[PDB]
């Protein structure tokens, strides 16, 4: 919750959390962990626009946003961009630090970090503290380098 992790289905969010890492409850599949004394929670963006107003109070303590993208997924990169931008438009996340995990860099034909940067529009985010990190969530490569940057931005 102090850090939120967002990304399209199949980006690798659950995979990353198992790197950082039960009783039945009806409801949302909450994934959360404490890492280095900071709470990280996957925030599932899968509903309609209409239910986003309900979210607001939850983001009051949120200081950082991890955005995870499947770098091998050229057909959905624009939809990822639109989601990132939706999240960055939340009033309560105005000052949130942004870390982008350019994930699935192990795949032979994945877009590189420079291309992902262009396509997610990071260069247009002139008043935002952001960083992009190349990652392979299955092997763990790049994850801790990105989290270390984010850690340090929080103070």
């Amino acid at each position: 919750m102090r850090i939120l992790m967002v990304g399209l289905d199949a980006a690798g969010k659950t995979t990353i959390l198992y790197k950082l890492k039960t009783i039945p409850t009806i409801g949302f599949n909450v994934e959360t962990v404490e890492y280095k004394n900071i709470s990280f929670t996957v925030w599932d963006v899968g509903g309609q626009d209409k239910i986003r107003p309900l979210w607001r109070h939850y983001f009051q303590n949120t200081q950082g946003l991890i955005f995870v993208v499947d770098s091998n997924d050229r057909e959905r990169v624009n939809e990822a961009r639109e989601e990132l931008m939706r999240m960055l438009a939340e009033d309560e996340l105005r000052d949130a630090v942004l870390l982008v995990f350019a994930n699935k860099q192990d795949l032979p034909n994945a877009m590189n970090a420079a291309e992902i940067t262009d396509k997610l529009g990071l260069h247009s985010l002139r008043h935002r503290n952001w960083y992009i990190q190349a990652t392979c969530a299955t092997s763990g490569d790049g994850l801790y380098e990105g989290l270390d940057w984010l850690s340090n931005q929080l103070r």
């Binding site: 919750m1 009806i26 409801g27 709470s39 107003p53 309900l54």
Partner: protein
């Protein structure tokens, strides 16, 4: 011919539990189920030998067939004279709610249309009903999923729903009644049959 049809029926249900699509495909090809959303939903609704998590998984697919089944399945429920939580407790016993927000969303909107039809005049629009219903699913997860560290008080819940009523607020007592219901009794985990 009767012991034989019963054996095919039992096999269809087993195949449904493993792979909903495939089990429905087996039933339809073997002439034990009409291939219409209405007849499939009637087969699922209180169906003996069907795993409620399979039922939920099947109802939560995005394919148009499944969305039509979902609406006909919602249509089987009787929500008249119930408050929202009481109606949700009935709906959510019929199948295991998936965990993905996209699916919960679509299911709450479908539930909403029938809630309002059963109870005209309780809410001013179906969207108000749908957003409130979704906030109840959030409240049940918030309160009763132990991974959620800090829980909403009443006051957070009333505040979350500010403005959902076509710009305005619902009466505080209606929200409090929903909050207290969920606080003292989580949605039950459904059991098969």
């Amino acid at each position: 011919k009767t012991l034989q049809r019963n054996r095919k029926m039992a096999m269809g249900r087993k195949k449904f539990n493993m792979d909903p699509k495939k089990g429905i495909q087996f039933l339809v090809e073997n002439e034990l189920l009409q291939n219409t959303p209405e007849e499939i939903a009637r087969f699922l609704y209180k169906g003996e030998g069907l795993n409620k998590t399979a039922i939920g998984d099947y109802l939560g697919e995005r394919e148009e067939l499944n969305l039509a089944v979902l609406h006909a399945f919602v249509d089987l429920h009787e929500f008249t004279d119930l408050n929202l939580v009481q109606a949700l407790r009935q709906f959510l016993w019929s199948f295991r709610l998936p965990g993905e927000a996209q699916k919960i969303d679509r299911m709450m909107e479908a539930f909403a249309q029938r809630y309002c039809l059963c109870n005209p005049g309780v809410f001013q629009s179906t969207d108000t009903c749908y957003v409130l219903s979704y906030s109840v699913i959030m409240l049940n997860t918030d309160l009763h999923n132990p991974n959620v560290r800090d829980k909403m008080g009443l006051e957070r819940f009333v505040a979350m729903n500010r403005g959902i009523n076509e710009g305005g607020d619902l009466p505080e007592e209606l929200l409090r009644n929903l909050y207290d219901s969920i606080r003292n009794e989580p949605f039950k985990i459904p059991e098969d049959d």
